[PDB]
Design a binder for this molecule. Structure first.
Ligand SMILES: C/C=C/C(=O)c1ccc2cc(OC)ccc2c1
Length: 243
């Protein structure tokens, strides 16, 4: 990884030394990017329900996963420990108790964390341009693919987009986030969406969504929407979205 500052470097250092787990998965991968493409063809609104317990309305992660299973295209499960109160064991039990795709959402800096995700039952992993060099991102990209997991590449700005496309990313999440504040820059997010090629599956992160926003973003080529705060506070809004 890079050498950063602040809590993000603390997290990078935690990831560097995180021990690899002793586990094996219980079902095949269920491809998240492919399921999004299927939902698009079938005209089903594709929502990734984003779960965290803490960050820099706390919910039971199992119960949340089961609640979202009938409606969501996938689940994002935060497995970073110190700042997000994530666990590998919670990932494992979520992945063995729902049959929709699971994104392991963490700060991946080494291959053994990808091994961990596969062995715990995740269907894909997040990779973050900001914390990696291009060479590192390319090597982790190809590592994840090898398992059958098209990773979701996180971009926060145009430089990040350009690195992602330079290494052949096929699945991108547009956070447009300042990790120091947890801000999503909605203006920059729209700009970045408009720069992504049509054959890359593209997923903005939204805390809250406006009436018309989902429709407007779909008109910009968005394939799925990863929604955090609104669904944690009001999980029932996923019904409205799909129905
Ligand atoms: C890649 C996983 C990231 C997040 O879900 C996430 C959530 C809340 C955050 C709040 C912050 O405020 C200081 C900073 C980063 C944050 C990152």
């Amino acid at each position: 990884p890079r050498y950063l500052k602040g809590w993000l470097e603390d997290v990078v250092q935690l990831s560097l030394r995180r021990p690899s787990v002793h586990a094996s998965r219980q079902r095949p991968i269920i491809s998240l990017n492919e399921r999004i493409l299927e939902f698009n063809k079938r005209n089903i609104t594709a929502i990734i329900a984003y779960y965290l317990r803490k960050s820099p309305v706390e919910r039971d992660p199992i119960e949340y996963a089961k609640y979202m299973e009938p409606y969501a295209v996938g689940l994002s499960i935060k497995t970073e420990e110190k700042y997000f109160d994530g666990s590998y064991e919670m990932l494992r039990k979520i992945a063995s108790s729902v049959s929709i795709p699971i994104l392991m959402n963490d700060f991946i800096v080494k291959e053994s964390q990808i091994d961990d995700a596969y062995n715990l039952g995740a269907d894909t992993v997040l990779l973050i341009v900001e914390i990696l060099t291009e060479r590192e991102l390319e090597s982790l990209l190809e590592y994840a693919r090898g398992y059958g997991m098209e990773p979701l590449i996180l971009i926060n700005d145009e430089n990040d987009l350009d690195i992602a496309l330079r290494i052949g990313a096929r699945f991108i999440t547009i956070y447009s986030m300042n990790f120091e504040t947890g801000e999503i820059n909605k203006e920059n997010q729209r700009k970045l969406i408009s720069m992504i090629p049509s054959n890359v599956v593209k997923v903005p992160l939204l805390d809250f969504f406006e009436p018309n926003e989902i429709e407007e973003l779909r008109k910009l080529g968005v394939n799925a929407f990863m929604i955090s705060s609104s669904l944690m506070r009001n999980p029932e809004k996923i019904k409205e979205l799909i129905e």
